[PDB]
Every structure is written in structure tokens, then in C-alpha cells.
Design an enzyme around this catalytic site. Sequence first.
Site, PDB file in Angstrom:
ATOM      1  N   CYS A 156      87.526  36.047  68.158  1.00  0.00           N
ATOM      2  CA  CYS A 156      89.001  36.387  68.572  1.00  0.00           C
ATOM      3  C   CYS A 156      90.066  35.824  67.150  1.00  0.00           C
ATOM      4  O   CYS A 156      90.365  37.160  66.634  1.00  0.00           O
ATOM      5  CB  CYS A 156      88.787  35.321  69.180  1.00  0.00           C
ATOM      6  SG  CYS A 156      87.699  34.101  68.758  1.00  0.00           S
ATOM      7  N   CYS A 176      79.291  51.282 101.074  1.00  0.00           N
ATOM      8  CA  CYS A 176      80.818  52.102 101.070  1.00  0.00           C
ATOM      9  C   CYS A 176      80.831  51.848  99.086  1.00  0.00           C
ATOM     10  O   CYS A 176      80.057  51.843  98.637  1.00  0.00           O
ATOM     11  CB  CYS A 176      81.532  50.501 101.322  1.00  0.00           C
ATOM     12  SG  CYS A 176      83.348  51.609 100.525  1.00  0.00           S
ATOM     13  N   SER A 200      65.613  -4.470  83.860  1.00  0.00           N
ATOM     14  CA  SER A 200      64.876  -5.122  85.313  1.00  0.00           C
ATOM     15  C   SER A 200      64.435  -4.081  85.849  1.00  0.00           C
ATOM     16  O   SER A 200      63.771  -4.125  86.298  1.00  0.00           O
ATOM     17  CB  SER A 200      65.029  -6.909  84.961  1.00  0.00           C
ATOM     18  OG  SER A 200      66.174  -6.530  85.987  1.00  0.00           O
ATOM     19  N   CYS A 259      81.670  33.253  65.695  1.00  0.00           N
ATOM     20  CA  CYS A 259      82.641  32.784  66.596  1.00  0.00           C
ATOM     21  C   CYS A 259      83.087  32.537  67.605  1.00  0.00           C
ATOM     22  O   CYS A 259      81.789  32.271  68.724  1.00  0.00           O
ATOM     23  CB  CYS A 259      82.585  34.243  67.592  1.00  0.00           C
ATOM     24  SG  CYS A 259      84.821  34.184  68.676  1.00  0.00           S
ATOM     25  N   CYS A 311      66.028   6.995  78.708  1.00  0.00           N
ATOM     26  CA  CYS A 311      66.252   8.171  78.293  1.00  0.00           C
ATOM     27  C   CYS A 311      67.310   8.822  77.991  1.00  0.00           C
ATOM     28  O   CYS A 311      67.370   9.820  76.844  1.00  0.00           O
ATOM     29  CB  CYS A 311      64.577   8.602  77.726  1.00  0.00           C
ATOM     30  SG  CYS A 311      64.727   9.586  79.292  1.00  0.00           S
ATOM     31  N   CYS A 334      78.680  38.310  75.116  1.00  0.00           N
ATOM     32  CA  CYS A 334      78.233  38.911  73.916  1.00  0.00           C
ATOM     33  C   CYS A 334      78.725  39.727  72.726  1.00  0.00           C
ATOM     34  O   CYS A 334      78.913  40.856  72.203  1.00  0.00           O
ATOM     35  CB  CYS A 334      76.990  39.495  73.505  1.00  0.00           C
ATOM     36  SG  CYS A 334      75.878  37.801  73.424  1.00  0.00           S
ATOM     37  N   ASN A 372      62.370   4.497  89.921  1.00  0.00           N
ATOM     38  CA  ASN A 372      62.804   3.694  88.524  1.00  0.00           C
ATOM     39  C   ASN A 372      61.638   2.986  88.024  1.00  0.00           C
ATOM     40  O   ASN A 372      61.382   2.643  86.779  1.00  0.00           O
ATOM     41  CB  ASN A 372      64.471   3.836  88.399  1.00  0.00           C
ATOM     42  CG  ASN A 372      64.644   4.239  88.511  1.00  0.00           C
ATOM     43  OD1 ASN A 372      64.776   5.591  88.353  1.00  0.00           O
ATOM     44  ND2 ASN A 372      66.505   3.812  88.843  1.00  0.00           N
TER      45      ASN A 372
HETATM   46  N1  LIG Z   1      73.345  -0.678  79.103  1.00  0.00           N
HETATM   47  C1  LIG Z   1      72.328  -0.990  80.468  1.00  0.00           C
HETATM   48  N2  LIG Z   1      72.147  -2.358  80.619  1.00  0.00           N
HETATM   49  C2  LIG Z   1      71.679  -3.169  81.618  1.00  0.00           C
HETATM   50  N3  LIG Z   1      71.125  -2.231  82.355  1.00  0.00           N
HETATM   51  C3  LIG Z   1      71.388  -1.113  82.060  1.00  0.00           C
HETATM   52  C4  LIG Z   1      71.792  -0.384  80.898  1.00  0.00           C
HETATM   53  N4  LIG Z   1      71.924   1.219  81.469  1.00  0.00           N
HETATM   54  C5  LIG Z   1      70.395   1.418  81.764  1.00  0.00           C
HETATM   55  N5  LIG Z   1      70.284  -0.034  82.816  1.00  0.00           N
HETATM   56  C6  LIG Z   1      69.112   0.087  84.160  1.00  0.00           C
HETATM   57  O1  LIG Z   1      67.901  -0.240  83.956  1.00  0.00           O
HETATM   58  C7  LIG Z   1      67.199   0.163  84.661  1.00  0.00           C
HETATM   59  C8  LIG Z   1      65.549   1.135  84.128  1.00  0.00           C
HETATM   60  S1  LIG Z   1      64.353   1.487  85.390  1.00  0.00           S
HETATM   61  C9  LIG Z   1      64.418  -0.117  85.519  1.00  0.00           C
HETATM   62  C10 LIG Z   1      62.818  -0.258  85.025  1.00  0.00           C
HETATM   63  C11 LIG Z   1      62.102  -0.511  86.084  1.00  0.00           C
HETATM   64  N6  LIG Z   1      63.555  -0.802  87.767  1.00  0.00           N
HETATM   65  C12 LIG Z   1      60.438  -1.110  86.063  1.00  0.00           C
HETATM   66  O2  LIG Z   1      60.157  -1.568  86.832  1.00  0.00           O
HETATM   67  O3  LIG Z   1      60.515  -1.910  85.102  1.00  0.00           O
HETATM   68  C13 LIG Z   1      67.846   0.918  85.477  1.00  0.00           C
HETATM   69  O4  LIG Z   1      68.254   0.304  86.696  1.00  0.00           O
HETATM   70  C14 LIG Z   1      69.294   0.746  85.248  1.00  0.00           C
HETATM   71  O5  LIG Z   1      69.787   0.986  86.307  1.00  0.00           O
HETATM   72 ZN   LIG Z   2      86.255  33.465  66.692  1.00  0.00          ZN
HETATM   73 ZN   LIG Z   3      84.425  50.012 101.801  1.00  0.00          ZN
HETATM   74 ZN   LIG Z   4      74.374  37.330  75.810  1.00  0.00          ZN
END
Ligand SMILES: Nc1ncnc2c1ncn2[C@@H]1O[C@H](CSCC[C@H](N)C(=O)O)[C@@H](O)[C@H]1O
Ligand SMILES: [Zn+2]
Ligand SMILES: [Zn+2]
Ligand SMILES: [Zn+2]
Length: 1169
Positions: free
Chosen positions: A276, A3, A710, A298, A790, A271, A1142
Site C-alpha cells: 500500500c 447456471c 480457589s 506491508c 494460563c 498476498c 476447572n
Molecule cells: N484475577 C483473579 N483473581 C482471583 N481469582 C481469579 C482471577 N482470575 C481468575 N480467577 C479464578 O481462578 C480460578 C482458576 S480454576 C480454579 C481452580 C480449581 N477450582 C481447583 O480446585 O483448584 C477460576 O475459577 C477463576 O474464576
Molecule cells: Zn503498506
Molecule cells: Zn443463474
Molecule cells: Zn496468503
Amino acid sequence: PKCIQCGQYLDDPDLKYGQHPPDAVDEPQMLTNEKALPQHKLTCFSVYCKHGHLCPIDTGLIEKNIELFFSGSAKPIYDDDPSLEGGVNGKNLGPINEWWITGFDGGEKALIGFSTSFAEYILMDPSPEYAPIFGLMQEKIYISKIVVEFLQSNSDSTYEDLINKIETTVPPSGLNLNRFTEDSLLRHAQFVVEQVESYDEAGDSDEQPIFLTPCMRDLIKLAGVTLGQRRAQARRQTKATTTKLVYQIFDTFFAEQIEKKRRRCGVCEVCQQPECGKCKACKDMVKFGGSGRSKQACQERRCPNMAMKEADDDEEVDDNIPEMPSPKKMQGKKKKQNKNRISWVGEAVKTDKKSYYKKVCIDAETLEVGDCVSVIPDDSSKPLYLARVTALWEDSSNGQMFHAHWFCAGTDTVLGATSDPLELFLVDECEDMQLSYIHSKVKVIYKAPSENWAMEGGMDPESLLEGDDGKTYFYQLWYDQDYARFESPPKTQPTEDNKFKFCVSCARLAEMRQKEIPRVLEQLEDLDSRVLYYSATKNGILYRVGDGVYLPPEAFTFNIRKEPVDEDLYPEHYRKYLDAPEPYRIGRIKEIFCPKKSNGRPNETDIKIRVNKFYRPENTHKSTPASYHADINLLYWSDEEAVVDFKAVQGRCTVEYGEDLPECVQVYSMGGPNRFYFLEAYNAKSKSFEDPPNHARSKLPKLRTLDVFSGCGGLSEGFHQAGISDTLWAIEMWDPAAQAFRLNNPGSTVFTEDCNILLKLVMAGETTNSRGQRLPQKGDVEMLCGGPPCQGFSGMNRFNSRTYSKFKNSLVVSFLSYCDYYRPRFFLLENVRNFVSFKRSMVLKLTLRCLVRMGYQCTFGVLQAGQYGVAQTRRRAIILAAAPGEKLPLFPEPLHVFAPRACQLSVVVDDKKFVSNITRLSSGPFRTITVRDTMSDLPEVRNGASALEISYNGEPQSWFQRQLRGAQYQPILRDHICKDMSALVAARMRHIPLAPGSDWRDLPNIEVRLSDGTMARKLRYTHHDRKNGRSSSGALRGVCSCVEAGKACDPAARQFNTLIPWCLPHTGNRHNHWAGLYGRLEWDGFFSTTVTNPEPMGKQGRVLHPEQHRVVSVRECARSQGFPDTYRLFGNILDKHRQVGNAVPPPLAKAIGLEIKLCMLAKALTRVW
Ligand SMILES: Nc1ncnc2c1ncn2[C@@H]1O[C@H](CSCC[C@H](N)C(=O)O)[C@@H](O)[C@H]1O
Ligand SMILES: [Zn+2]
Ligand SMILES: [Zn+2]
Ligand SMILES: [Zn+2]
Ligand SMILES: [Zn+2]
Ligand SMILES: [Zn+2]
């Protein structure tokens, strides 16, 4: 054929027109309505263009100034009855100016309002004709609302996390859907992202915008979302527990390092908007009317396209430069100084080239052996050189001499500028030099660890600060620049003959040069052409006649277009257009000999080895399939012989006739490394087997370990298998993982808490938590290990002020505080490969710096999981650390051969290439573990299998399966369960062929009934792609308008609920044709990575079963991680999938654990003088 008004196609798919009773058009607001602008309600409504097609109001037609009109029956504003009873029938109302969401009822249908040039209209129920169109818009709004609220809860969520959220979200009753799917998101990707974008634009800050969330970035790439446009619908509107020492390190680094290509696309609407003037950025502009210092663009003009590319660059390692050759010895000329007088003191301590060793000398200063001096290089970028005077002598040919054992400045190490500017490191570099080159005497203090170093954790560094320092150079550790190893100084003591001459560097370099020379040891027999030998040494290993020996695969050899494709049936097939080396040759030494030269004396510059070949089952005429069932440990005797260079040998192994063994093969094979066995001989010429000829016959206490982060215990499991550890304490915040850890570790104390909480309690003096669990104290923890996520610090771009604060209180800092406080004997930090490269390698450098400051020996390295008996390509950064008094462990040599492109283990920090002790470069003794080795024995299950406990329905078929099943009588197969993929995805999997290399590009373009009752219609190709051309049949291959030059994406060209996902040909050209998506695993292949949540269009590689029409199961993922089948997992299926994913694979953790056992043995059985 579309259309001219709305973009909809005149012919097909399912168009619709308007229907009127018919009655009046706008301005007749007089019937009941007559009683700034007026407002009324409108029920049984329908929106349409000038040609009368039912149009959606949310695809940008109104804003492109295409006039959309509408009809329905108007009602008084106070009316709540949607029933028409009731109302005045209107027609051709409009055109629509604004449209907005007035809110949600309960629920949760969105309440939309129109606005004409006359009045405003709050909508009620749509006409039966317009009901489906309004339902999609209803679906767009709700899904977008869920996404926004989801992204606010977590800034790290991945693509598969997003899908799971969508799939578990119960659709409102207004929509007659009972579930959302991945297709539901891709269907409305453009609208959803626009809402996601407009969430940020409203609320300006410095933090990452909500659309740069990983799941959103993948969605914007998978679906072809156009960024940077419009925002009108509104109507207005984890902190680290630290010790003083650890805190001080990261706090001082901040203070001393706080302050500080790509450009805007220029084409997006963001862009093309003027500055503003209401934001802080514009208020700080010289052009009306700020300082102009910030120089920030901006706030309402930050290009999202540019943002995406910066996010892409941040995830890239920039770069893995080829060479990057080897680190040169820290070399050149030195400045001859002009001192006045140089005189000896006392007289010659020793006399020998008539060298007369002295003890003291005068330069207007006094120097003794053991003192430290400075030497000036004639300089390139070179700083002052510092060395220890290890000897003083007068040569009768050379002048007055001293031997200099060089120190290494901390900044020249991997530590870089994070190093204490006055800290030095001992080094394997030394040199004879003339006294005339000495610039000055220098004080270098050896900062040895105090005798209660293990208890100084957590102490105020001001308490240990005494006394009066640091004013001069100091050292505490030896440094290896090739391997980035910080170790305690050698305790090697000199003889009474060596006292005033001894140099540790010379001694170590002497032992090094001796081991690297292949040398004949014992003679055996003298023949005319050659001399036989009983033994020889190479790389510190004693080879004797009859020993097993590793040889490179090239040491000796053994005696040994389709029909055309229907491109209408398979319209995307046109988009389809190094290996692992062989394991070691194994031979038994029959002879060690050297050829006699012309003079009749044996030439021991080249040592030869006559060897009896051993056949692996794969080397047999049976070839590769013979390895499927065979032990990875098994060989066959042969009477074939070969002569090789002794230089070629790669190590010594044990090859034993199985019957002669004093024990079981399983016990034997599990007894130590490099153990092979044979039961039969193999005749190549007869291609048969037979009994071998008879001339072929012939304690430490576990470390009390604390595992932080762990998980379910993959890392602890491996260490337990190594026999070095007893994990008595574990910290895991996520309950299902902690629960699973308890099941496999009955004698452990698992704290389901944040790691920051516990240490705070222990540093407070508490002995138990609120639940009454006995907290670990000083002395309890002998080994500390952990793999912290990480997500807080995982960018490659350099640190800034904001991003560092997030790392300043990260779990790495928390984990280092555990190490500082408890002061364990050994310390392991596991992480992703790029941990080594995060923040221009500052995360690694600060981590190492922190350990060095604490007085720990430490090193790092990258390990490939597949090289240790697992069908998976994943690398990990491993930081090792050992207390003073311990031996710093090496990284384990690869046990399994593996593809070299997955074995890039080197590391670049500040343009310095770093490498681990590993000598086996993608070579090895054992064959590659395949997917077949991993799961070929598991019984067939279906998509959505949920039976937790079933039978194996058969015996193990591979060595790998035999080892992981264990020696149980009638074992239960646990968690062979898999996700219940949606109807559309399930149909897609069923049509992926079994041939290896098959993926989405093999999908047929056909109509099929889906299990949800719906029909998946064929994908319609609507445009011509000049980058791919037409098919051989002459069919179009384009799927959107954005396939032509400089054209925007066309709505109503979008297609969904198709077997071939519309989004894949849409964006395939920009992403390698999405090769791998919906791809099956190969039996001869491997897992692309750690699978945590298997999605066909996800980011975790191929996840389809090699033969069965389903996604891989939890057990299959656990098998890929080398988990024993008896290892228990906990929670729902997604909880179990994430646990396994994990985890550190136990075969890898065990290999690491064994290197630690060696150090434990060394400290226990080796003493020094
Ligand atoms: N602030 C914290 N305190 C304790 N454990 C945490 C945390 N933040 C994340 N984790 C835990 O840390 C783990 C990292 S992966 C665990 C490693 C893996 N199972 C091994 O065999 O080595 C996650 O399961 C997560 O649940
Ligand atoms: Zn601005
Ligand atoms: Zn139309
Ligand atoms: Zn752009
Ligand atoms: Zn020396
Ligand atoms: Zn497009």
C-alpha cells in the site's frame, strides 16, 4: 448442472425465478423520481442473474464481475412507506456495482443500499419471492456483528464459548427465528470470518488479530473457511500486585533480556495485493522512502494462512525428542597446573594406605579443609570448576591429594541463564584429585536464611542488601539434576574421627548404593540345596516372611467382519478405515531362600522368593466383570505357589484376612496405603470359592491454608481429605465458584475479589476489606496453594517484548508475591501440563528462579490424573515449594494402572530431560477406574434434564460409586442435569450407535423430522473426491468443489440442517476425518479431558453418554473429577459445568497432600545431629 452466470444448481434444491407486473427498466427515472449521483428508495425488491434466478448478493458474484440485476418499485428518497402504493415499478436495474450497509433500524434489521451506473438505491422491504434470500443475508450480517463484538470482549474465548454466545443471543424480530444454533454459525461461517478479518484490516496494530481467537481458529478449521479476501461493506469507519523482591526479579529479567519457519501462502488475495504505502511498515521502507530498519512486511499484506500456521506452531511442543538420554555427571580430564611449591603445614592429623591426613597446605596461598578451590578442565564447553576441599592427605603411592566436593554453576541447573551468574549449588558429585590440579583458592559464601526469614517478606531488598556483595561466589541450596530438586543442605555432622576427612557427598552416595542392593538379612534354616531366610532388604524396605509383596504382572501366571455396509445409508462410514498394563501381582512370602553353589555355601547374589498367589476378582474364571462390583481392595486367597526373583519385587503391601481385622474393612482400607484384604479362597481347578485355610490367618495440627484462585474447591477438598489442611481463606473472583466454595467450607473466609486487590490492602496495613472481612496477615498463612489460569502466557514460542509484558503482570507473578509476602511453610502451584513448556520453558524457569531467590526449596513435575483413581486423561504441571527448615515433598507414586501414552511425565528444558521421583512407570497396585466405575449407577435422564434434586433409584454398583456416595441414609442425587442441545444436535445423538468407537461417521443419511418442526434433508454429494474415491455403489463422496485439484470452494454447494453435518466431510481429509466428534464415551474407557462445557463438535473430546441420547451431565463430570456426590455446586448449569471442569480432582490433590503430611511428620518427629 449449474447456471453459467450464478453458481446455483439448475436442478434443485429450492430455486426461484422473478415475477414482474410487468413494467419499465432503468433510465425511466422520470415518474416521481425526477424533481453526486441521485438517490431513491426501493421496496418489494428482488435480485437476479442474467437467467433470472433469485441470487444472494453476498457470496462474491459481484466481485467476480458476474452481473447481478434487480427489480422492484422505486420511491422518492424521503418516503418511509414500504407499501408500493406509492412507487414506480422498475425492472432489470443495474448491474449492481457496490452494495453496503447503511446502518441498522430499531431493530435490528440491517439497511442495505445498492448503486447502479445511474443512481443509488436504499432498500426497504423485499418482494415475497426474495424474502427468504434477504432473510439469510439478514441473518449473516447480525450473527457476524455479534461475533465481532464478542471477540472484542475476550481474546481467549474457546469454541464452546462462542456457541453459547450465539445460542443465548436473541434473534431480531425481523427474522422469524426464536433462537440461533451452532448450525446458524456454521451456515454463515465464510461470511462471518470475512467480517471478522475485515475488522482487523481496517485497524492495524501489533496485537493479535481478532480472527486468531481460539474459537475463530476452530471455526475456520471445522467449517472450511477460505481466508484472506475483500473488505468493502463499511462506508468509512489484570495488573499484578507485587512485592519489591518479586517485581525486581521479573523487571531485571526484562531489562537484561528484551530484544529478539513458514512464509506467506502467496495464493490468497491478501498476498496478491501490492504494498500500500500508507502504513508505518511501508513508510519505513528504503524503496520510497524510509530507513529500512524494521524490515516489516506491508501492513496490508500479512498472510492470514501463514498466521494460522504460526498459531498452530505456537501451540505445539517442539519437541518431545525421543532421546534425550539421561543427564551426564558434570566428567572429563583436568589441567595439571604448574605451581612452584606445594608444602604441608603442621604435621599429620591422622595416619592410616599409609595415608597421612594433613590439615593445612601451602601453594604460596594457604588451604585448609573447608576452603574452596578452582579447577580447570581441559575444556570442551566447560567453565571453571569449583569445589570444596573436604580432605587433605598424602598417599604413599599417589602424590599429594585432596578430595573435591563439586559445586554446580546455576546456569547448568534447570534455571539456565535466568540464574545469578555467581550463585552455585551443592551437588552429589565428588572426586579424589591431586593437589597439582588446583588452579587457585576461591571464596564461596554460604548464604543461609536469616532467623526471621518468615517475616522478611515484602521488605525492600536494599534493606537486607548489607553488606558489600555480591562480589564472589555464593550458595544456599543443594541441587539434584535428575529431578530438578532444589533443597536445603544436609545438616549431617561429622564424628570427631571424621572432622578433617568428612564428605557429605561420599556419605549420601554410600547410603544410596547400600539401599539399591537387594541383601539377605536374617537366616532361618539350613537345608541341603538351599538356605532359608527370615528377612531381606531392598530399596530401604524390610521384607519378612509372611509379608505381602508387589510383583510385575509377568512374575507368575495363574491357573486360568460385519456384513457389507449400505454406503448410501451410511456414506461416511468408510472414513473409519497400547493398553494399560495389568496391576501388580500380589503374593504372600512363604519362603526367602538362596541356592547353595558347588562349594556348599549359600549364593546370596540371587535371592529367591516362594510366594502364595493371590487372585484378584479379574484373575478368576469370572474374569473382568467380577471387578465391576468388587472392592478395588479385594483379593482371594490361593494355594497356588510360585518362585520369583527378589529383584522382581516392587514393594511391600498388607494383605489381611478380613475376619481377623480389629475393625471395619472401610476403616482398615482407609487407614493407610497398600492395604489389601481377602475373605475367601478360590480353587482354580474347581472354579469355585470357599473359606480360606487357617494357615492363611495370623495427631498433627492442620496447616492454616490460603487457596488463591480457589474455584469451587477441588484442590482444597483433596487436601482436607489428606488431613493436612484447613482452608481458612480463599480468593475467587468469579462469584458462582466462590459461592460454591462457601457451601462446602462454612468455616472459611472467601473473598469474592481479584487476588491483586487483597494483597495490595494487606501490604497497605489494612486488616479488613470494605465488606469487613478479616484479611490474613503474616503468620496466619502456613500453606499457600493455587491454580492460576494460563490464558495470559500460554504460548510455546519464545518471549518477545509485547508478550513478556503480559506475563510480567500475570497471575503467576501475583501468586508468587503471595508466597514471598506470607512466606508459608509449603507452596503449591497447579497448572496445565504445558505450563512447563510455555515460552520455551521460560515461564517455569522464571518461576523456579523467583522461588530460589526467595530462599525456597522447590521442584516441579507432571502428574497424570488417571493414575490416581479417576476415569480421565489429564496431565498437570505441579510446582512444589517448601520453606527453609521444612522437608521438600516428593511427588506421589501412581496408585492406579493407566495407559502409557497418557503417562508421558518427562520434561525437556534447554535440551535437558527432567524426571520426577516417580518409579512406577504406568504400573501400579490398583486397576484402572473406568467410565462404568464412574457413572453406571446414575438413573436415566434426557437431553435437557433440569431437575436439580432427584433420587438415585438404586444402590451403588462399584467401589468408586460406594466411596463417592458416602454413608448417608437416603442421599439426594444433585445436579444430574444436562444441557438442552438443539433439535438438530439431539436428532444426531439419537442416531449414534451404542457400539464402542461410534461417532459422527456412523450417522445415517436420512430425512428426519426435528423437534423444532423442521425437516433435516439428506446430505447431497456433489463432487468426486480422488483422495477417497467413489463408494462401492458408485456414489460421489465429495461435498464441495474444493475436493478437486486447485479448485476454490463453491458456494451453493453448502448445505445445512442435515443429520450428517456438511462441514465434516468438507474438511475431514485435513483433520483425521474428525475422528471422535459426536463420539460416545466407552464404558471401559475414560474422559478425554476436563469437560467444562460439553459440545459434540467441541475440543473437549467425546461427550456423549455411552447409552443415553444426551450429552454428559454435571454430576457425571463431577464423578469423572472424583468429586463426592455430597459436594455442592452453585449457579446455572453452565456455571456448574465450568466449576467442575476447572477443578483439580480431589483424588489427585489428596495424593499430593499425603506427601506433604510425611514432611510435616518428619519435621515433627525427626531431629538432626
Ligand atoms: N484475577 C483473579 N483473581 C482471583 N481469582 C481469579 C482471577 N482470575 C481468575 N480467577 C479464578 O481462578 C480460578 C482458576 S480454576 C480454579 C481452580 C480449581 N477450582 C481447583 O480446585 O483448584 C477460576 O475459577 C477463576 O474464576
Ligand atoms: Zn503498506
Ligand atoms: Zn443463474
Ligand atoms: Zn496468503
Ligand atoms: Zn566425596
Ligand atoms: Zn470447499
